[model samples]
Target: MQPQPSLKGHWTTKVIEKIGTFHDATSLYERVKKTCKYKYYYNDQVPNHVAVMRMTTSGINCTDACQLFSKVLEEMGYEVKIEHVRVKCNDGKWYGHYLLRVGGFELKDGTIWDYVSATKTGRPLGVPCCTAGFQHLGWGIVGPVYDK
Candidate 1:
């Protein structure tokens, strides 16, 4: 069997600067899952967007999770962006999903940080950059919002 991947030198160390950052993507994802109480609810009342700090106080949803990961990767010195995905749910309804793209344009050697699915599946679910498209029906770029 293949050995498990370790995050001893992952990009997280530059930003978090904590011991937990040393775990592999899977391990790190699992750690966050325990604390991340996923909810399908969000308030769009005004421009009240969730902040990175608030995530620790209040639970985070899928979109918030995407924003959190994107912000963390950016602070860690990586070029990342939030991708908004339109997935066709089993109910025959369209639902929105979110994920992070590690590379800006050159996706050949980049990764997809899918914290949402990982949280639900209880494991790391990062995929190759190009494969993100096939994983969902369609996707678009989400601009960063600066709340007052």
Candidate 2:
């Protein structure tokens, strides 16, 4: 129901064409099924814009996807930022992940909306990053922290 009233920079026909039927940032992950696969390359991470341009049906990596996703959310008038996290998974190992924190948005359950898992897996808001535990490692190049 929240389609973009207009499109701008990098949010042209190409991006809309690639994603199939996503109406807005909310629909981008919340409603639509993500066709992209999470790809991790050793030393050749692509740029954010390039990531969207190069996005095949397979999509982009987690961090890159979150970056692209953030742009969309921002354009749609939502305050958002990318978060870097070190999650301790149930497998007893720690792994790095990127999450999107949206500000001032309320959730379906009446809690203030917090983080978004903008990945191929498409985990919704409020879901745990890992079954074990997690902590903020860095944020948007600031080694920054999220508000408690």
Candidate 3:
């Protein structure tokens, strides 16, 4: 939930070096956003740094992606809170998912900024209706499930 400076590893150092100069939190976010290509693996998950390291080929799950975001954002003086989310698909199906709240920056586009949406859709900071026909409901709003 907080900036995790300890999570920074060899690749993290490279990413920060790649970013070079960032004027503010948003800029840091934007610059870091460009370092990876999201390939969305739906099965098992891994740790933050591992996810970051594997992002190029093997890809990672939503949980792994957001976890990486949490660690990196927290290390940069931002607070990221995980949210249990559900997305409503356009085909009338709903799915469970995970996301994170990026602190230190206000909602510039009115809609919430989800790292998953941004990375998967290539959209800007705000995406209420995700680019590929997915609509993210609020925290714990599992539109498709309530089972134990």
Model 2 worst lDDT window (10 residues): 107-116
What digit string (tens of lDDT, one per residue) describes model 1 on residues 1-148? 6343323333354324422342344344555655445555653211113433344455556666665566555544456666666555445655566766674322323566666565553434464212323445334445568998
Give candidate 2 misplaced runs (Cα > 4 Å): 1-9, 104-122, 142-148
What lDDT does each candidate get? 0.50, 0.55, 0.55
| Rank ordering of all candidates by lDDT, starting from the highest | 2, 3, 1
State how far residue 111 of model 2 sits from its true place (Å). Answer: 9.4
TM-score of each: 0.54, 0.68, 0.62
How much is the lDDT of residue 99 in candidate 2? Answer: 67
Highest TM-score: give the candidate number.
2
24-88 in candidate 3: lDDT tens per residue? 44554466466545665654567655775675455566667666666666566555666665677
Candidate 1 TM-score, true structure as reference: 0.54
Q: Which ranges of candidate 3 are over 4 A from the true structure?
A: 1-14, 17-25, 105-111, 128-148
lDDT of 2 by residue, 16-112 (tens): 7666755444555543245445666632456766776655544566566666766766665556767777777668998777767664333232211
lDDT of 3 at 37: 54
Give the count of colliding residue pairs in each prediction.
1, 2, 4
Model 1 residue 28 CA deviation (Å) reads 3.4
| Candidates ranked by TM-score | 2, 3, 1
